[PDB]
């Protein structure tokens, strides 16, 4: 059912409808010679769409907009990037050129600028302290603490019980950390426990890369992170 990394040529984007007015978007990218899938989110709000994260690069993000127009046909008016890496902000310039108001926390914008990644235009206030939550149209934005990155946000869709964990949450198929160059390994399990504590009702949990599942993805991620720590 859910699109897998093997089925998506690099440059194409698939959409997966989760609930009324909630989709994930799935793209693939080459990185260090391997191909990785990557997820983002689309949430309807009236006759407009909120986009969560780019599709990992300008070409993919243009394909994303075209797939949204083809399959949904409503305009993306705002976008949120959930941390500063290129699978989250790469494509922000494509969004901006299309008339999308792009958003990220000041921390994400700061880090993207330091790293040389695309910088979302608008700032999300009220998210700088672990445990902070703010409403953003049809979603809630939550800063759980440092994890995969110091700036990573999670997104919750209360109407659909969809928890988008982004890259702080691993799919079950991933049993090793991979790359954690920007991570806070010491804090990551605590940050996951904040997500659990804040969204225990979540039914559909979406990792930054790979297959969705339930809240068991949180304990799974902690297991992997602790094993890597050791």
Active site amino acids: 83, 85, 87, 148, 179
Q: How far is the CB of 229 from ligand [O-] (least distance, A)?
A: 19
144 binds, among Cl ion, ligand [O-], Zn ion, none (CB under 5 to 8 A by kind): none
Q: What is the DSSP string of 22-57?
A: EEEEEEEEEETTEEEEEEEEEEEETTEEEEES--SS
* Residues 159, 106: Cα–Cα separation, whole Å: 27
Count of residues of this chain found to bind ligand [O-] when the rule CB under 6 A is applied: 4
Find, among 223, 111, 112, 215, the residue nearest to 154 by Cα.
215
Is 1 annotated as a binding-site member? no
Out of 87, 118, 151, 171, the residue judged to bind ligand [O-] by CB under 6 A: 87
Is 171 within any annotated ligand binding site? yes
Our CA angle for 141, 187, 158, nearest 5°, is: 20
CA end-to-end span of the chain: 35
168 belongs to the binding site for ligand [O-] (CB under 6 A): no
Q: Which residues does residue 207 pair with via DSSP β-bridges, in sequence order?
A: 166
Q: By CB under 5 A, is residue 151 in contact with Zn ion? A: no
Binding site, annotated residues for Zn(2+):
47, 83, 85, 87, 122, 148, 167, 209, 220
Give the binding site for ligand [O-] (CB under 6 A). Answer: 85, 87, 167, 208
């Amino acid at each position: 059912e859910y699109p897998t990394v093997s089925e998506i040529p690099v440059g194409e984007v698939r959409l997966y409808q989760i609930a009324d007015g909630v989709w994930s978007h799935i793209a693939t990218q080459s990185f260090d010679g391997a191909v990785y899938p990557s997820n983002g989110l689309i949430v309807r709000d009236g006759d407009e769409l909120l986009l969560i994260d780019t599709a990992w690069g300008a070409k993919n993000t243009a394909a994303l907009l075209a797939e949204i127009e083809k399959q949904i046909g409503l305009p993306v008016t705002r976008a949120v990037s959930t941390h500063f890496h290129d699978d989250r902000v790469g494509g922000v310039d494509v969004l901006r050129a299309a008339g999308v108001a792009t958003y990220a926390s000041p921390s994400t914008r700061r880090l993207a600028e330091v790293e040389g990644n695309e910088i979302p235009t608008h700032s999300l206030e009220g998210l700088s302290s672990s445990g902070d939550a703010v409403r953003f149209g049809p979603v809630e934005l939550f800063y759980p603490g440092a994890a995969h990155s110091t700036d990573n946000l999670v997104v919750y869709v209360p109407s659909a019980s969809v928890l988008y964990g982004g890259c702080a949450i691993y799919e079950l198929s991933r049993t090793s950390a991979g790359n954690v160059a920007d991570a806070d390994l010491a804090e990551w399990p605590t940050s996951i426990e904040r997500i659990q504590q804040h969204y225990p009702e979540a039914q559909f949990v979406i990792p930054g890369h790979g297959l969705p599942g339930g809240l068991d993805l949180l304990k799974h991620t902690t297991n992997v992170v602790k094993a890597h720590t050791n």
